[PDB]
Amino acid sequence: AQNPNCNIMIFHPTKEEFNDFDKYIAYMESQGAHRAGLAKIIPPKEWKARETYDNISEILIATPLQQVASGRAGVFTQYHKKKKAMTVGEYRHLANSKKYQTPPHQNFEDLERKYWKNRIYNSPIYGADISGSLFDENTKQWNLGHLGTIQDLLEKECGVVIEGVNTPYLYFGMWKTTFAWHTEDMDLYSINYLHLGEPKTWYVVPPEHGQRLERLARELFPGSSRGCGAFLRHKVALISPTVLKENGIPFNRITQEAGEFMVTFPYGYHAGFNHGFNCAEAINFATPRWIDYGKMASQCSCGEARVTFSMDAFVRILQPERYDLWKRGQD
Numbered sequence: 001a002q003n004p005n006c007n008i009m010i011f012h013p014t015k016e017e018f019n020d021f022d023k024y025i026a027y028m029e030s031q032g033a034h035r036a037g038l039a040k041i042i043p044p045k046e047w048k049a050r051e052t053y054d055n056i057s058e059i060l061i062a063t064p065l066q067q068v069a070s071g072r073a074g075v076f077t078q079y080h081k082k083k084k085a086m087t088v089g090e091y092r093h094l095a096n097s098k099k100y101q102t103p104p105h106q107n108f109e110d111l112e113r114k115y116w117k118n119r120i121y122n123s124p125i126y127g128a129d130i131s132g133s134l135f136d137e138n139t140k141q142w143n144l145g146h147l148g149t150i151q152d153l154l155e156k157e158c159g160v161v162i163e164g165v166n167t168p169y170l171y172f173g174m175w176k177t178t179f180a181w182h183t184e185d186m187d188l189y190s191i192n193y194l195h196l197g198e199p200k201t202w203y204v205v206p207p208e209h210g211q212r213l214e215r216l217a218r219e220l221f222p223g224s225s226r227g228c229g230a231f232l233r234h235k236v237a238l239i240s241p242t243v244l245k246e247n248g249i250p251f252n253r254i255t256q257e258a259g260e261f262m263v264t265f266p267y268g269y270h271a272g273f274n275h276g277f278n279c280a281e282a283i284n285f286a287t288p289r290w291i292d293y294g295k296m297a298s299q300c301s302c303g304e305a306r307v308t309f310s311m312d313a314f315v316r317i318l319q320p321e322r323y324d325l326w327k328r329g330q331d
């Protein structure tokens with residue numbers, strides 16, 4: 001069995017190996033990459049996502065989200081308070097202001113210590129979940145707006161044609177902006193490209209151990225757990241590496257830098273934080289190996305998780321028994 005300790009693997013494809021996206025995912029899996037839940041892919045030196053980032057300031061962040069924490073430093077939830085619209089140029093200036101800017105630090109490990117010590121005492125503002133793309137149309141390799149769609153994959157594997165679309169999303173971050181512990185909708189893959197700016201630190205639980213994280217979360221967030229049998233779908237709970245180690249939960253960590261891709265694998269729980277002003281692009285995707293995970297994915301039916309139009313068909317076809325309850329949660 002490849003990668004039996006579930007370490008995060010880093011790949012360096014050549015320009016030739018970067019042509020065929022599906023083939024390279026399947027290659028990484030042949031080497032055991034999925035066992036970690038997360039892999040890093042460093043593009044060949046010949047590749048670029050676009051020519052420059054000099055002309056992005058007029059993109060609008062219609063609903064910036066202020067991430068307000070409650071709890072203790074290593075075990076907290078966050079809620080998202082909506083703020084007035086602002087442009088990317090306005091948000092960048094805000095991120096760089098004395099109130100929000102990255103503090104002085106020695107290295108990534110010092111900054112990580114400062115994040116976990118101090119995150120809860122601040123409320124950073126995240127420009128998340130913005131439909132759009134920064135890949136040039138002429139970039140043919142690993143262009144996250146030109147991937148095979150999940151609806152086409154389901155149709156190729158199972159024969160059923162379904163409605164829905166699959167487009168990318170932009171994330172504009174600042175110091176301390178936070179992504180809570182989650183797996184993807186329907187336990188899909190994700191791919192994330194860090195276009196510019198400061199790093200993103202990731203934490204991940206191997207898919208084979210995901211239920212250990214879920215059991216810890218029910219213990220640490222007992223009110224939330226009574227409210228919903230899949231409350232990590234709400235994407236609000238944070239647990240620090242120190243607390244995970246104290247409770248024996250297997251996990252790994254890695255820092256993504258500008259110009260690098262990260263892939264999350266089906267049922268790989270992940271969480272993390274941004275180091276300073278940055279912009280990432282991400283999208284969900286599927287492969288044949290996903291289908292079995294989609295059929296078994298938990299679902300939130302309490303009303304909180306509310307998701308895209310395109311998840312309807314995935315529930316309806318892969319999980320018909322659960323469909324009626326889940327759709328009630330959507331309505």
Ligand SMILES: O=C(O)CNC(=O)C(=O)O
Pocket residue numbers: 171178179190191192264270280282283
């Ligand atoms: O970058 C973020 O805020 C969160 N991204 C992801 O969870 C992802 O790409 O799967």
Ligand SMILES: [Mg+2]
Pocket residue numbers: 055056057058059
């Ligand atoms: Mg612009």
Ligand code: NI
Pocket residue numbers: 182183184190264270
């Ligand atoms: Ni994710």
Ligand SMILES: [Zn+2]
Pocket residue numbers: 227228229230231233234300301302303304305
């Ligand atoms: Zn719920």
